[PDB]
Amino acid sequence: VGACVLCNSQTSLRCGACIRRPFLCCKCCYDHVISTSHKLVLSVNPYVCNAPGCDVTDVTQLYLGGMSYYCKSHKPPISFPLCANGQVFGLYKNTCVGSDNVTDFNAIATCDWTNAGDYILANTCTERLKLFAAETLKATEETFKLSYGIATVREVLSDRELHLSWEVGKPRPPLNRNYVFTGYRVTKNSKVQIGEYTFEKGAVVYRGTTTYKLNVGDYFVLTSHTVMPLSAPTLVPQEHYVRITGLYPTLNISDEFSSNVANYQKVGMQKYSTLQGPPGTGKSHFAIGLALYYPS
Amino acid sequence: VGACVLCNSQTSLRCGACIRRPFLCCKCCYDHVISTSHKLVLSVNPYVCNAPGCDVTDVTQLYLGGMSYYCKSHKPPISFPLCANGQVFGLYKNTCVGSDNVTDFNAIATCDWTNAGDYILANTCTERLKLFAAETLKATEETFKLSYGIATVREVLSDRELHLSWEVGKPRPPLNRNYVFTGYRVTKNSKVQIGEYTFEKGAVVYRGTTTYKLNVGDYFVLTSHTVMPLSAPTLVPQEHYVRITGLYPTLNISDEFSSNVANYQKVGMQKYSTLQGPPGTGKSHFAIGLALYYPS
Amino acid sequence: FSSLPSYAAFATAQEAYEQAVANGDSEVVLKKLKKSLNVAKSEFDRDAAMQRKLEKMADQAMTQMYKQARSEDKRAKVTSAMQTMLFTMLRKLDNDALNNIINNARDGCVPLNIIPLTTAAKLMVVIPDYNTYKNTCDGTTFTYASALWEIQQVVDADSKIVQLSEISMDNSPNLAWPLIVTALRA
Amino acid sequence: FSSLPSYAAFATAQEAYEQAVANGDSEVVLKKLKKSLNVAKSEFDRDAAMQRKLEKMADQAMTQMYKQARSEDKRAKVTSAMQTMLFTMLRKLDNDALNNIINNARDGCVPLNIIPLTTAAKLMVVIPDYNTYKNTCDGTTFTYASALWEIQQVVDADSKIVQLSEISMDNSPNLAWPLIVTALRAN
Amino acid sequence: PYPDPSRILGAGCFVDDIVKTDGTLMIERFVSLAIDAYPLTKHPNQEYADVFHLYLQYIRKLHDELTGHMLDMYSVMLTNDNTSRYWEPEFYEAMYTPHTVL
RNA sequence: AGCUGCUCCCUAGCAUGCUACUACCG
RNA sequence: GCGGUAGUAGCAUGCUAGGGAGCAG
Ligand SMILES: [Zn+2]
Ligand SMILES: [Zn+2]
Ligand SMILES: [Zn+2]
Ligand SMILES: [Zn+2]
Ligand SMILES: [Zn+2]
Ligand SMILES: [Zn+2]
């Protein structure tokens, strides 16, 4: 019950086939639910037929018959199509702005994250859509990785050496420092703390975080989160004001900060000065010298 | 529940866009509500639609359907428009004198207090309209000034010397003897007494009323009141009677008050003598001489 | 409700049929007034109903508004009505002791504690000037609340003893006047 | 309700009836263009009476789910309130006296009536009269429930501070007289 | 069944809210209290029937004083839409006769 | 600041039921 | 001339919902 992603209007409808379950206003929801592979809409109650044993869950076909929502094959005479005027039935039916060019959101919704072009559109759009694309991307990332081969090592080769078994029907993901797993210790009922470790060439050698001694029965996965919605943009709006706002002028500095003084002022005189850095130019020294310039 | 400003008729309605919330007769209110920028009316209850989540607060669309007051887009059949006959529905639906010429009241009502003519019209009308205009003028004064610069002095320069910071997005008032601020001492929760001081050229110098020593964190604004409606006119009705009423004839006087005695009688035999004074003619000497002339 | 538009139409139709029954020619040419007329009663009773109950709906809304206004303005004035009521009731009771203490309090003499009822127990009364001292205190006996109390001690506004025979006419401008007598009931 | 498909049809039927009324030719003029009008009767009856029921049912549904949304928000509000209360009273509780008595119990269970009696840090006494004061908490330290307590503060029925010198046998009738004593556990 | 007369008179004179000290704002309180007091009309003690009669007279006075306010403070003409049944004994006698209307 | 029971008044709605006027077909 | 249905108006009885009040244990 909040603003929709493309219109900033209070609605109550959510794409059922999306991953984020985003808010979409009535005409805006009509657009997205006819123009992509999102076929479901949920409101304060889910718009699904109530006749026992129905599993057709499109958007246009459903019919509202009072305290229920039907399909045309499920429909007593007193009704009205839930889809008319190009506008789905839901709260705040009037005061929704909608949007005609929503093919950008449509593509983001259908973006399955395979091509580079997916990332290109995901990085070319506007702000809250940036957020939606980002969180859909990370959610699809964890759908990707967790469902792959189980790290079920079923014996120990030697000191820091192991023998590997993995999931059947689903392949196994890389074993590199770019791919960090997480351990769970099986007992007669459930799992216990082990931690994150890495696998490499062995016959499996593990570059463990810390010392561990695991016998058989153990197996690993690379755990993840359940990423929730965000709040804020990628950056703050800029500034071109007259003051070093909120801080204190300087008395002391070391002359090795000579190249540091000239850029201290620009970062604090306006909202943000985005730093590019060649390798080993003194950036962290600069990032430490920030507090050196103003102890306060 | 009191008599109107332009009619001396007890009403129960109130102009919703107004600031002083004045009392208006049904037909008289109709004049004022369709002839200015005052779009709402308040009664014992507010005449607003009870359809959940509506924001159209004009006057003419609203419809009464029993113990509720709707929109036309919010309407059940059995009703009557709240607006008819040039008369908004309310208590005293019969005995309201109204006024055909209320463009004086109307002008006062849309007087935004920028041109001289606003003052001129405020200063040319009759009594109760004059009180209305004066109190709206103060109310707009407090709206104007308090919503300007907070004086968040963030460091001290020297003795009676300060460094200035103040709010962004809204400009800052002048720092003169005509603009007296008032202090508040902020602690971990809220503010404490500081007092009213002045700022001047520094780098800010404060010609404070009394001694005070403030470190960083404090900030200043110019406090005000929440002015209520008044009770009485600018001046009483005049007199041309025979008696110096209620006082006691004179036996002793000083010869410096020779020019004073001749004017003491006129302030005494009639209701008021309006005192005009060139700079330094003994008006105060005269003003203390009244009790010197009449010690009772 | 007769000042309505369709009244003219209905009256026209009924007068025409009165003429038709006063002439009595046909059966369906006279049914003209009735095909013509039942339309009149389908557009006059369809409009002399909604406003007739609207007339009552309006009066009941305004009675409700009046009652809410009066109810909310009654409870904004409790502590003036209550005191006015109390003093009318006390006046019409007309008791001697209550009138005594109320008149005294009106001119200045008030107590400092609750008036005791036992023949023992102490009473303290503020006396603000000589004149009100003449009427009540003569000798060492006090007259208050239609009773008699025997004086035991008088002290000044300076919280120091003043002997009783000192209080008289000539010396009255010599004592900070709001004294306090202290008496026991006889 | 004027943009319906049959407003135009009844309009043209009555318009042709008007054209023939300006004509006025035959008996079929009457019969027909009272039956062009008498066909456009069902239009403007069902199309303007079934349109008068769907809208009422739609309004019913919208009001109902407004109600349900509000009832769903108040539930989350009260959930947060209860959680904050529980976790707040949790942090005056997890001391070592509690664990000490709990671990001395053979099966983990203890009576609830002995937890404030053995682990509380502060005691409150309510005294009706002076005779009871003399026998319970006279002095500046007293013993109750197998421990030693040390007085800080005494207030009266008006929540005003009394000093221990005032509480006497001849000053007793000048005090508002339930007194409330507060003491701290001595170690 | 009939009640103690002091109970009904006390419910008349003493109330728990200040709004109930104005009669014209409710009136229904007195209609209900008069329903409770009807069977005292059959008592042999004459000072017991007077309670029911006092209640009916007071109800009539309150109705008149409420209707004579909208004609002066405002200009509303109230019509006695069968409100005259409340200050006659038939409406109250009907509540103790066996043929319901609950 | 509670749990029950009974009674009066006001508004809304639903179907039902009775009753009146118009139209169509048989 | 009657029946059936479809509309529109007025009237009662019953049920539900909401609000206001009174008594009893
Ligand atoms: Zn949208
Ligand atoms: Zn979707
Ligand atoms: Zn279905
Ligand atoms: Zn206004
Ligand atoms: Zn007026
Ligand atoms: Zn509205």
PDB file of all heavy atoms in Angstrom, chain F residues 7-17:
ATOM      1  P     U F   7     -37.103  -7.698  24.780  1.00  0.00           P
ATOM      2  OP1   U F   7     -38.376  -8.293  24.315  1.00  0.00           O
ATOM      3  OP2   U F   7     -35.875  -7.855  23.965  1.00  0.00           O
ATOM      4  O5'   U F   7     -37.338  -6.142  25.011  1.00  0.00           O
ATOM      5  C5'   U F   7     -38.474  -5.677  25.723  1.00  0.00           C
ATOM      6  C4'   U F   7     -38.351  -4.220  26.093  1.00  0.00           C
ATOM      7  O4'   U F   7     -37.135  -3.995  26.851  1.00  0.00           O
ATOM      8  C3'   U F   7     -38.245  -3.231  24.945  1.00  0.00           C
ATOM      9  O3'   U F   7     -39.490  -2.948  24.330  1.00  0.00           O
ATOM     10  C2'   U F   7     -37.611  -2.021  25.617  1.00  0.00           C
ATOM     11  O2'   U F   7     -38.575  -1.299  26.369  1.00  0.00           O
ATOM     12  C1'   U F   7     -36.648  -2.692  26.597  1.00  0.00           C
ATOM     13  N1    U F   7     -35.271  -2.778  26.057  1.00  0.00           N
ATOM     14  C2    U F   7     -34.526  -1.619  26.061  1.00  0.00           C
ATOM     15  O2    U F   7     -34.950  -0.558  26.482  1.00  0.00           O
ATOM     16  N3    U F   7     -33.260  -1.740  25.553  1.00  0.00           N
ATOM     17  C4    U F   7     -32.667  -2.875  25.051  1.00  0.00           C
ATOM     18  O4    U F   7     -31.513  -2.821  24.629  1.00  0.00           O
ATOM     19  C5    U F   7     -33.497  -4.034  25.079  1.00  0.00           C
ATOM     20  C6    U F   7     -34.738  -3.946  25.569  1.00  0.00           C
ATOM     21  P     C F   8     -39.544  -2.474  22.796  1.00  0.00           P
ATOM     22  OP1   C F   8     -40.948  -2.582  22.337  1.00  0.00           O
ATOM     23  OP2   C F   8     -38.469  -3.172  22.052  1.00  0.00           O
ATOM     24  O5'   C F   8     -39.169  -0.928  22.849  1.00  0.00           O
ATOM     25  C5'   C F   8     -40.073   0.021  23.390  1.00  0.00           C
ATOM     26  C4'   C F   8     -39.423   1.367  23.598  1.00  0.00           C
ATOM     27  O4'   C F   8     -38.189   1.220  24.348  1.00  0.00           O
ATOM     28  C3'   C F   8     -38.993   2.114  22.347  1.00  0.00           C
ATOM     29  O3'   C F   8     -40.067   2.755  21.679  1.00  0.00           O
ATOM     30  C2'   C F   8     -37.949   3.079  22.891  1.00  0.00           C
ATOM     31  O2'   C F   8     -38.574   4.166  23.557  1.00  0.00           O
ATOM     32  C1'   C F   8     -37.262   2.212  23.946  1.00  0.00           C
ATOM     33  N1    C F   8     -36.030   1.551  23.444  1.00  0.00           N
ATOM     34  C2    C F   8     -34.870   2.296  23.175  1.00  0.00           C
ATOM     35  O2    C F   8     -34.888   3.521  23.348  1.00  0.00           O
ATOM     36  N3    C F   8     -33.758   1.660  22.725  1.00  0.00           N
ATOM     37  C4    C F   8     -33.760   0.340  22.550  1.00  0.00           C
ATOM     38  N4    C F   8     -32.649  -0.255  22.105  1.00  0.00           N
ATOM     39  C5    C F   8     -34.916  -0.440  22.820  1.00  0.00           C
ATOM     40  C6    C F   8     -36.005   0.198  23.262  1.00  0.00           C
ATOM     41  P     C F   9     -40.136   2.751  20.074  1.00  0.00           P
ATOM     42  OP1   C F   9     -41.480   3.219  19.666  1.00  0.00           O
ATOM     43  OP2   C F   9     -39.640   1.440  19.596  1.00  0.00           O
ATOM     44  O5'   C F   9     -39.080   3.859  19.636  1.00  0.00           O
ATOM     45  C5'   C F   9     -39.277   5.221  19.978  1.00  0.00           C
ATOM     46  C4'   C F   9     -38.010   6.029  19.839  1.00  0.00           C
ATOM     47  O4'   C F   9     -36.941   5.422  20.609  1.00  0.00           O
ATOM     48  C3'   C F   9     -37.427   6.138  18.442  1.00  0.00           C
ATOM     49  O3'   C F   9     -38.092   7.088  17.628  1.00  0.00           O
ATOM     50  C2'   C F   9     -35.974   6.496  18.723  1.00  0.00           C
ATOM     51  O2'   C F   9     -35.850   7.871  19.055  1.00  0.00           O
ATOM     52  C1'   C F   9     -35.699   5.678  19.983  1.00  0.00           C
ATOM     53  N1    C F   9     -35.010   4.394  19.706  1.00  0.00           N
ATOM     54  C2    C F   9     -33.670   4.422  19.302  1.00  0.00           C
ATOM     55  O2    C F   9     -33.117   5.522  19.177  1.00  0.00           O
ATOM     56  N3    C F   9     -33.021   3.261  19.056  1.00  0.00           N
ATOM     57  C4    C F   9     -33.655   2.098  19.207  1.00  0.00           C
ATOM     58  N4    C F   9     -32.978   0.975  18.955  1.00  0.00           N
ATOM     59  C5    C F   9     -35.014   2.036  19.623  1.00  0.00           C
ATOM     60  C6    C F   9     -35.643   3.193  19.861  1.00  0.00           C
ATOM     61  P     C F  10     -38.372   6.763  16.082  1.00  0.00           P
ATOM     62  OP1   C F  10     -39.343   7.765  15.577  1.00  0.00           O
ATOM     63  OP2   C F  10     -38.684   5.317  15.970  1.00  0.00           O
ATOM     64  O5'   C F  10     -36.973   7.017  15.366  1.00  0.00           O
ATOM     65  C5'   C F  10     -36.445   8.330  15.251  1.00  0.00           C
ATOM     66  C4'   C F  10     -35.001   8.327  14.814  1.00  0.00           C
ATOM     67  O4'   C F  10     -34.197   7.542  15.732  1.00  0.00           O
ATOM     68  C3'   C F  10     -34.698   7.712  13.459  1.00  0.00           C
ATOM     69  O3'   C F  10     -35.010   8.571  12.378  1.00  0.00           O
ATOM     70  C2'   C F  10     -33.214   7.392  13.571  1.00  0.00           C
ATOM     71  O2'   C F  10     -32.435   8.564  13.393  1.00  0.00           O
ATOM     72  C1'   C F  10     -33.106   6.971  15.038  1.00  0.00           C
ATOM     73  N1    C F  10     -33.115   5.502  15.224  1.00  0.00           N
ATOM     74  C2    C F  10     -31.933   4.807  14.968  1.00  0.00           C
ATOM     75  O2    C F  10     -30.956   5.463  14.589  1.00  0.00           O
ATOM     76  N3    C F  10     -31.891   3.468  15.137  1.00  0.00           N
ATOM     77  C4    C F  10     -32.975   2.815  15.552  1.00  0.00           C
ATOM     78  N4    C F  10     -32.892   1.492  15.707  1.00  0.00           N
ATOM     79  C5    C F  10     -34.195   3.496  15.828  1.00  0.00           C
ATOM     80  C6    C F  10     -34.219   4.823  15.655  1.00  0.00           C
ATOM     81  P     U F  11     -35.605   7.967  11.014  1.00  0.00           P
ATOM     82  OP1   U F  11     -36.217   9.084  10.256  1.00  0.00           O
ATOM     83  OP2   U F  11     -36.415   6.769  11.347  1.00  0.00           O
ATOM     84  O5'   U F  11     -34.318   7.479  10.212  1.00  0.00           O
ATOM     85  C5'   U F  11     -33.336   8.410   9.787  1.00  0.00           C
ATOM     86  C4'   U F  11     -32.029   7.737   9.451  1.00  0.00           C
ATOM     87  O4'   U F  11     -31.552   6.980  10.592  1.00  0.00           O
ATOM     88  C3'   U F  11     -32.060   6.716   8.329  1.00  0.00           C
ATOM     89  O3'   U F  11     -32.050   7.308   7.042  1.00  0.00           O
ATOM     90  C2'   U F  11     -30.827   5.872   8.620  1.00  0.00           C
ATOM     91  O2'   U F  11     -29.651   6.537   8.185  1.00  0.00           O
ATOM     92  C1'   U F  11     -30.826   5.853  10.149  1.00  0.00           C
ATOM     93  N1    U F  11     -31.441   4.623  10.703  1.00  0.00           N
ATOM     94  C2    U F  11     -30.648   3.496  10.768  1.00  0.00           C
ATOM     95  O2    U F  11     -29.492   3.483  10.385  1.00  0.00           O
ATOM     96  N3    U F  11     -31.250   2.380  11.292  1.00  0.00           N
ATOM     97  C4    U F  11     -32.547   2.284  11.752  1.00  0.00           C
ATOM     98  O4    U F  11     -32.964   1.216  12.201  1.00  0.00           O
ATOM     99  C5    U F  11     -33.303   3.491  11.655  1.00  0.00           C
ATOM    100  C6    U F  11     -32.740   4.590  11.149  1.00  0.00           C
ATOM    101  P     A F  12     -32.604   6.498   5.767  1.00  0.00           P
ATOM    102  OP1   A F  12     -32.487   7.389   4.588  1.00  0.00           O
ATOM    103  OP2   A F  12     -33.918   5.904   6.111  1.00  0.00           O
ATOM    104  O5'   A F  12     -31.546   5.327   5.558  1.00  0.00           O
ATOM    105  C5'   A F  12     -30.256   5.612   5.041  1.00  0.00           C
ATOM    106  C4'   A F  12     -29.364   4.395   5.040  1.00  0.00           C
ATOM    107  O4'   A F  12     -29.244   3.859   6.384  1.00  0.00           O
ATOM    108  C3'   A F  12     -29.841   3.210   4.221  1.00  0.00           C
ATOM    109  O3'   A F  12     -29.614   3.358   2.832  1.00  0.00           O
ATOM    110  C2'   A F  12     -29.076   2.058   4.852  1.00  0.00           C
ATOM    111  O2'   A F  12     -27.719   2.074   4.437  1.00  0.00           O
ATOM    112  C1'   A F  12     -29.127   2.451   6.325  1.00  0.00           C
ATOM    113  N9    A F  12     -30.287   1.851   7.010  1.00  0.00           N
ATOM    114  C8    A F  12     -31.494   2.432   7.304  1.00  0.00           C
ATOM    115  N7    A F  12     -32.327   1.631   7.923  1.00  0.00           N
ATOM    116  C5    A F  12     -31.621   0.442   8.043  1.00  0.00           C
ATOM    117  C6    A F  12     -31.941  -0.806   8.608  1.00  0.00           C
ATOM    118  N6    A F  12     -33.110  -1.083   9.186  1.00  0.00           N
ATOM    119  N1    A F  12     -31.005  -1.782   8.560  1.00  0.00           N
ATOM    120  C2    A F  12     -29.834  -1.508   7.979  1.00  0.00           C
ATOM    121  N3    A F  12     -29.417  -0.378   7.418  1.00  0.00           N
ATOM    122  C4    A F  12     -30.367   0.566   7.484  1.00  0.00           C
ATOM    123  P     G F  13     -30.741   2.900   1.784  1.00  0.00           P
ATOM    124  OP1   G F  13     -30.515   3.642   0.519  1.00  0.00           O
ATOM    125  OP2   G F  13     -32.061   2.974   2.457  1.00  0.00           O
ATOM    126  O5'   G F  13     -30.425   1.361   1.537  1.00  0.00           O
ATOM    127  C5'   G F  13     -29.086   0.904   1.474  1.00  0.00           C
ATOM    128  C4'   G F  13     -28.967  -0.548   1.861  1.00  0.00           C
ATOM    129  O4'   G F  13     -29.207  -0.728   3.283  1.00  0.00           O
ATOM    130  C3'   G F  13     -29.957  -1.502   1.225  1.00  0.00           C
ATOM    131  O3'   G F  13     -29.677  -1.796  -0.129  1.00  0.00           O
ATOM    132  C2'   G F  13     -29.874  -2.704   2.153  1.00  0.00           C
ATOM    133  O2'   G F  13     -28.676  -3.433   1.926  1.00  0.00           O
ATOM    134  C1'   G F  13     -29.754  -2.014   3.509  1.00  0.00           C
ATOM    135  N9    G F  13     -31.066  -1.895   4.173  1.00  0.00           N
ATOM    136  C8    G F  13     -31.956  -0.850   4.168  1.00  0.00           C
ATOM    137  N7    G F  13     -33.034  -1.097   4.866  1.00  0.00           N
ATOM    138  C5    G F  13     -32.844  -2.384   5.356  1.00  0.00           C
ATOM    139  C6    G F  13     -33.661  -3.202   6.180  1.00  0.00           C
ATOM    140  O6    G F  13     -34.768  -2.946   6.665  1.00  0.00           O
ATOM    141  N1    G F  13     -33.073  -4.440   6.430  1.00  0.00           N
ATOM    142  C2    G F  13     -31.851  -4.845   5.952  1.00  0.00           C
ATOM    143  N2    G F  13     -31.431  -6.074   6.292  1.00  0.00           N
ATOM    144  N3    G F  13     -31.084  -4.090   5.186  1.00  0.00           N
ATOM    145  C4    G F  13     -31.637  -2.887   4.931  1.00  0.00           C
ATOM    146  P     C F  14     -30.877  -2.232  -1.104  1.00  0.00           P
ATOM    147  OP1   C F  14     -30.405  -2.112  -2.505  1.00  0.00           O
ATOM    148  OP2   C F  14     -32.105  -1.513  -0.678  1.00  0.00           O
ATOM    149  O5'   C F  14     -31.076  -3.774  -0.773  1.00  0.00           O
ATOM    150  C5'   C F  14     -29.955  -4.639  -0.715  1.00  0.00           C
ATOM    151  C4'   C F  14     -30.290  -5.950  -0.058  1.00  0.00           C
ATOM    152  O4'   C F  14     -30.481  -5.785   1.376  1.00  0.00           O
ATOM    153  C3'   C F  14     -31.581  -6.604  -0.495  1.00  0.00           C
ATOM    154  O3'   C F  14     -31.552  -7.154  -1.797  1.00  0.00           O
ATOM    155  C2'   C F  14     -31.814  -7.596   0.633  1.00  0.00           C
ATOM    156  O2'   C F  14     -30.898  -8.677   0.546  1.00  0.00           O
ATOM    157  C1'   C F  14     -31.431  -6.735   1.835  1.00  0.00           C
ATOM    158  N1    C F  14     -32.614  -6.025   2.383  1.00  0.00           N
ATOM    159  C2    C F  14     -33.393  -6.659   3.359  1.00  0.00           C
ATOM    160  O2    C F  14     -33.060  -7.787   3.751  1.00  0.00           O
ATOM    161  N3    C F  14     -34.482  -6.026   3.862  1.00  0.00           N
ATOM    162  C4    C F  14     -34.817  -4.812   3.419  1.00  0.00           C
ATOM    163  N4    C F  14     -35.898  -4.220   3.933  1.00  0.00           N
ATOM    164  C5    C F  14     -34.056  -4.146   2.420  1.00  0.00           C
ATOM    165  C6    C F  14     -32.981  -4.782   1.939  1.00  0.00           C
ATOM    166  P     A F  15     -32.648  -6.651  -2.858  1.00  0.00           P
ATOM    167  OP1   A F  15     -32.055  -6.676  -4.219  1.00  0.00           O
ATOM    168  OP2   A F  15     -33.223  -5.384  -2.335  1.00  0.00           O
ATOM    169  O5'   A F  15     -33.783  -7.761  -2.777  1.00  0.00           O
ATOM    170  C5'   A F  15     -33.480  -9.109  -3.090  1.00  0.00           C
ATOM    171  C4'   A F  15     -33.956 -10.063  -2.023  1.00  0.00           C
ATOM    172  O4'   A F  15     -33.599  -9.581  -0.701  1.00  0.00           O
ATOM    173  C3'   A F  15     -35.452 -10.275  -1.924  1.00  0.00           C
ATOM    174  O3'   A F  15     -35.964 -11.112  -2.945  1.00  0.00           O
ATOM    175  C2'   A F  15     -35.593 -10.851  -0.522  1.00  0.00           C
ATOM    176  O2'   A F  15     -35.193 -12.212  -0.493  1.00  0.00           O
ATOM    177  C1'   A F  15     -34.559 -10.027   0.239  1.00  0.00           C
ATOM    178  N9    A F  15     -35.194  -8.865   0.892  1.00  0.00           N
ATOM    179  C8    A F  15     -35.057  -7.527   0.623  1.00  0.00           C
ATOM    180  N7    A F  15     -35.794  -6.759   1.386  1.00  0.00           N
ATOM    181  C5    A F  15     -36.458  -7.648   2.218  1.00  0.00           C
ATOM    182  C6    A F  15     -37.402  -7.464   3.242  1.00  0.00           C
ATOM    183  N6    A F  15     -37.843  -6.271   3.635  1.00  0.00           N
ATOM    184  N1    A F  15     -37.889  -8.564   3.858  1.00  0.00           N
ATOM    185  C2    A F  15     -37.450  -9.762   3.463  1.00  0.00           C
ATOM    186  N3    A F  15     -36.574 -10.062   2.506  1.00  0.00           N
ATOM    187  C4    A F  15     -36.109  -8.947   1.915  1.00  0.00           C
ATOM    188  P     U F  16     -37.337 -10.724  -3.684  1.00  0.00           P
ATOM    189  OP1   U F  16     -37.402 -11.473  -4.965  1.00  0.00           O
ATOM    190  OP2   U F  16     -37.454  -9.243  -3.695  1.00  0.00           O
ATOM    191  O5'   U F  16     -38.460 -11.286  -2.707  1.00  0.00           O
ATOM    192  C5'   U F  16     -38.239 -12.471  -1.959  1.00  0.00           C
ATOM    193  C4'   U F  16     -39.072 -12.494  -0.704  1.00  0.00           C
ATOM    194  O4'   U F  16     -38.557 -11.565   0.285  1.00  0.00           O
ATOM    195  C3'   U F  16     -40.514 -12.073  -0.873  1.00  0.00           C
ATOM    196  O3'   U F  16     -41.311 -13.089  -1.450  1.00  0.00           O
ATOM    197  C2'   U F  16     -40.920 -11.696   0.546  1.00  0.00           C
ATOM    198  O2'   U F  16     -41.235 -12.852   1.309  1.00  0.00           O
ATOM    199  C1'   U F  16     -39.620 -11.091   1.089  1.00  0.00           C
ATOM    200  N1    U F  16     -39.633  -9.607   1.083  1.00  0.00           N
ATOM    201  C2    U F  16     -40.516  -8.953   1.930  1.00  0.00           C
ATOM    202  O2    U F  16     -41.306  -9.528   2.659  1.00  0.00           O
ATOM    203  N3    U F  16     -40.481  -7.581   1.872  1.00  0.00           N
ATOM    204  C4    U F  16     -39.657  -6.799   1.094  1.00  0.00           C
ATOM    205  O4    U F  16     -39.741  -5.571   1.165  1.00  0.00           O
ATOM    206  C5    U F  16     -38.770  -7.539   0.252  1.00  0.00           C
ATOM    207  C6    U F  16     -38.784  -8.878   0.281  1.00  0.00           C
ATOM    208  P     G F  17     -42.346 -12.723  -2.620  1.00  0.00           P
ATOM    209  OP1   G F  17     -42.668 -13.966  -3.369  1.00  0.00           O
ATOM    210  OP2   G F  17     -41.807 -11.547  -3.349  1.00  0.00           O
ATOM    211  O5'   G F  17     -43.644 -12.263  -1.825  1.00  0.00           O
ATOM    212  C5'   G F  17     -44.015 -12.912  -0.616  1.00  0.00           C
ATOM    213  C4'   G F  17     -44.883 -12.024   0.234  1.00  0.00           C
ATOM    214  O4'   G F  17     -44.069 -11.147   1.055  1.00  0.00           O
ATOM    215  C3'   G F  17     -45.782 -11.070  -0.526  1.00  0.00           C
ATOM    216  O3'   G F  17     -46.931 -11.698  -1.053  1.00  0.00           O
ATOM    217  C2'   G F  17     -46.076  -9.998   0.512  1.00  0.00           C
ATOM    218  O2'   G F  17     -47.046 -10.453   1.444  1.00  0.00           O
ATOM    219  C1'   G F  17     -44.730  -9.908   1.230  1.00  0.00           C
ATOM    220  N9    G F  17     -43.880  -8.832   0.686  1.00  0.00           N
ATOM    221  C8    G F  17     -42.732  -8.981  -0.047  1.00  0.00           C
ATOM    222  N7    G F  17     -42.173  -7.852  -0.380  1.00  0.00           N
ATOM    223  C5    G F  17     -43.017  -6.890   0.151  1.00  0.00           C
ATOM    224  C6    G F  17     -42.935  -5.475   0.104  1.00  0.00           C
ATOM    225  O6    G F  17     -42.073  -4.770  -0.435  1.00  0.00           O
ATOM    226  N1    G F  17     -44.003  -4.882   0.768  1.00  0.00           N
ATOM    227  C2    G F  17     -45.021  -5.560   1.393  1.00  0.00           C
ATOM    228  N2    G F  17     -45.958  -4.806   1.986  1.00  0.00           N
ATOM    229  N3    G F  17     -45.102  -6.878   1.451  1.00  0.00           N
ATOM    230  C4    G F  17     -44.074  -7.477   0.814  1.00  0.00           C
TER     231        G F  17
END
